[PDB]
Amino acid sequence: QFFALPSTPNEPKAVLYAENVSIEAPDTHLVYKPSADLLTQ
């Protein structure tokens, strides 16, 4: 997925691979969760 630039210069000035995955975490118990919606966990 390629992206852009406010400086429209409608040109791919910046792209990064997007790569799904499967997150474990054996070690973490979120201590303030307020999924793909949140952040700041």
């Binding site: 303030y32 307020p34 952040l39 700041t40």
Partner: protein
């Protein structure tokens, strides 16, 4: 602190209730929060 909504003469921070609330000064804030590392105080 308490980045809260509505401010009011004789009043000001509007914590909030059945209708509307307001705190008071023997304990306003002191050590409470934003805690979303991000709450950018916007309008209002």
């Amino acid at each position: 602190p308490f980045i809260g909504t509505n401010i009011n003469k004789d009043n000001g921070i509007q914590i909030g209730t059945d209708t509307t609330n307001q705190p008071i000064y023997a304990d306003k804030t002191y050590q409470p929060e934003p805690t979303q590392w991000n709450s950018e105080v916007g309008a209002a």
